[PDB]
């Protein structure tokens, strides 16, 4: 099928337009996806032939410029790169992205993309031109912002294409950090937290990675850019912590006070608190999770500025998303006070029993039948938790029996249909399975059949 659909294409695309070359188009471009290995055939034919169309000094009305672009998405990855070379030179590639053609950019894109060895163009210009394009707030199409992004992630891997970007450009770089103009600003973002995955402790450079207080009071002049700055600043914190980069703390957590104190000050900087609320506010939950001693950064941005507690209608959000160890630690009294079981707690139950001495503080809050007065989905989703953590565990098993009975069941489990209440239901059950038959005395035998019935139906 293949090696002949692209035959009849390369012939098609050879005459004048047949009526049906756009279906054929469509047809290349599903086969291509479904089988996924190309036979032994020679594409350059085909690629010299859509590079022509792409180049072409003429624009063809009966030919649909998307489904060919995608016919080429997918048929370099598959080729042998050094046949794609031939036709795409390095030369080709530069000439395709300072023209006026977007069609011909963006497949130059494909073909940079699919670079083989992935370094094979970092010792020409055709990374600066891409920052070039990249940065330029005229650009508009929105497909080759896409395609450009997408070779940079791809070829951002290689050591050597890290350093045309962080060395050969970063004056430049510098200078788009320095706009904070809406359109590149975002893509700058988006840019740097793509690169942050790969960067090592030696290449990072924290004149472009990091902000200064003075930046980051400036960014608030325009919301949008201070939004886009505070979620620039979560996932940064995420991404060192989901990839263990802690070198990387010691070069921002200096400016997170001056996130909190912008949360704070509502009345000179009303912006922040009226939009940027709900993002602030993850942030503050990572930044509570940094590995820093004894929350020496969090405990002072907390006094100073957060002043967890002193704002009601924001005591269920921080008890939702704020480290529980540091809550019990600093706001023991809020949580022994505020947390009452229900399904609307079942968020703040999630985060504060992740901590034993935090789940101590709410434990008193806990019994068979405040939770049995729940509906059986909501009761799943407290049980489920309670499962997660030894201590809790036993808890649930020494003191609320009845609610273990509750876990078993009456019999009608495998009739339930609700999406939430099997996979919570199940999840308990595993949970408990897992800790073994010894520490579940009378509950392992039930909790055997109930997951063997849930499990083989």
Same mark, same amino acid.
């Given at each position: &099928?293949?090696?002949?659909?692209?035959?009849?294409?390369?012939?098609?695309?050879?005459?004048?337009?047949?009526?049906?070359?756009?279906?054929?188009?469509? %047809?290349?471009?599903?086969?291509? /996806?479904?089988?996924?290995?190309?036979?032994?055939?020679?594409?350059?034919?085909?690629?010299?032939?859509? +590079?022509?169309?792409?180049?072409?000094?003429?624009?063809? !009305?009966?030919?649909?410029?998307?489904?060919?672009?995608?016919?080429?998405? %997918?048929?370099?990855? =598959?080729?042998?790169?050094?046949?794609?070379?031939?036709?795409?030179?390095?030369?080709?590639?530069?000439?395709?992205?300072?023209?006026?053609?977007?069609?011909?950019? &963006?497949?130059? *894109? $494909? /073909?940079?993309?699919?670079?083989?060895?992935?370094?094979?163009?970092?010792?020409?210009?055709?990374?600066?031109?891409?920052?070039?394009?990249? @940065?330029?707030?005229?650009?508009?199409?929105?497909?080759?912002?896409?395609?450009?992004?997408?070779?940079?992630?791809?070829?951002?891997?290689?050591?050597?294409? $890290?350093? $045309?970007?962080?060395?050969?450009?970063?004056?430049?770089?510098?200078?788009?950090?320095?706009? =904070?103009?809406?359109?590149?600003?975002?893509?700058?973002?988006? @840019?740097?937290?793509?690169?942050?995955?790969?960067?090592?402790?030696?290449?990072? +450079?924290?004149?472009?990675? *990091?902000?200064?207080?003075?930046?980051?009071?400036?960014? /608030?002049?325009?919301?949008?850019?201070?939004?886009?700055?505070?979620?620039?600043?979560?996932?940064?914190?995420?991404?060192?912590r989901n990839?263990?980069?802690?070198?990387?703390?010691?070069?921002?957590? %200096?400016?997170?006070?001056?996130?909190?104190?912008? @949360?704070?000050?509502?009345?000179?900087?009303?912006?922040?608190?009226?939009?940027?609320?709900? *993002?602030?506010?993850?942030?503050?939950?990572? /930044?509570?999770r940094?590995?820093?001693?004894?929350?020496?950064?969090?405990?002072? =941005?907390?006094?100073?500025?957060?002043?967890?507690?002193?704002?009601?209608?924001?005591?269920?959000?921080?008890l939702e998303?704020?480290n529980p160890q540091?809550?019990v630690?600093?706001? %023991? !009294?809020?949580v022994?006070?505020?947390f009452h079981v229900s399904g609307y707690s079942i968020g703040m139950l999630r985060n504060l029993s992740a901590d034993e001495e935090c789940f101590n503080a709410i434990r008193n809050k806990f019994s068979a039948e405040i939770v049995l007065r729940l509906p059986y989905l909501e009761q799943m989703q407290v049980v489920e938790t309670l499962t997660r953590y030894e201590y809790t565990s036993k808890f649930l098993l020494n003191e609320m029996p009845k609610v273990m009975g509750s876990l078993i069941g009456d019999g009608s489990a495998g009739a339930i249909i609700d999406l939430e209440t099997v996979h919570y239901r199940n999840s308990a059950l595993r949970n408990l399975l897992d800790k073994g038959e010894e520490k579940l005395s009378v509950w392992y035998e039930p909790l055997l059949r109930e997951y063997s019935k849930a499990v083989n139906g």
């Open positions: &099928v293949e090696n002949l659909l692209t035959q009849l294409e390369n012939e098609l695309n050879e005459d004048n337009l047949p009526e049906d070359i756009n279906t054929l188009l469509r %047809k290349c471009s599903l086969n291509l /996806v479904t089988v996924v290995s190309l036979p032994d055939m020679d594409v350059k034919p085909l690629l010299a032939t859509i +590079k022509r169309f792409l180049t072409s000094n003429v624009s063809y !009305d009966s030919l649909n410029y998307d489904y060919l672009l995608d016919v080429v998405d %997918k048929l370099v990855p =598959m080729a042998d790169f050094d046949d794609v070379l031939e036709v795409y030179s390095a030369e080709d590639l530069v000439k395709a992205l300072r023209s006026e053609i977007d069609p011909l950019k &963006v497949a130059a *894109c $494909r /073909v940079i993309e699919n670079s083989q060895p992935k370094g094979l163009f970092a010792t020409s210009n055709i990374i600066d031109i891409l920052l070039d394009i990249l @940065f330029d707030e005229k650009v508009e199409n929105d497909k080759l912002i896409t395609a450009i992004e997408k070779a940079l992630e791809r070829l951002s891997t290689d050591e050597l294409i $890290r350093r $045309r970007l962080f060395d050969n450009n970063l004056p430049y770089l510098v200078s788009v950090k320095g706009r =904070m103009e809406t359109v590149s600003f975002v893509r700058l973002i988006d @840019f740097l937290t793509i690169e942050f995955q790969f960067i090592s402790g030696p290449e990072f +450079k924290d004149i472009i990675f *990091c902000f200064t207080k003075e930046e980051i009071l400036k960014s /608030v002049e325009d919301i949008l850019v201070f939004i886009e700055l505070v979620n620039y600043y979560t996932k940064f914190l995420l991404e060192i990839q263990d980069k802690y070198w990387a703390l010691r070069h921002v957590k %200096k400016i997170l006070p001056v996130f909190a104190q912008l @949360f704070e000050d509502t009345e000179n900087y009303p912006d922040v608190r009226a939009f940027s609320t709900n *993002c602030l506010l993850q942030l503050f939950a990572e /930044v509570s940094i590995e820093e001693d004894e929350y020496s950064l969090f405990k002072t =941005m907390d006094k100073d500025s957060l002043k967890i507690g002193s704002e009601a209608k924001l005591i269920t959000e921080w998303l704020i540091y809550l630690k600093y706001h %023991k !009294d809020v022994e006070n505020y």
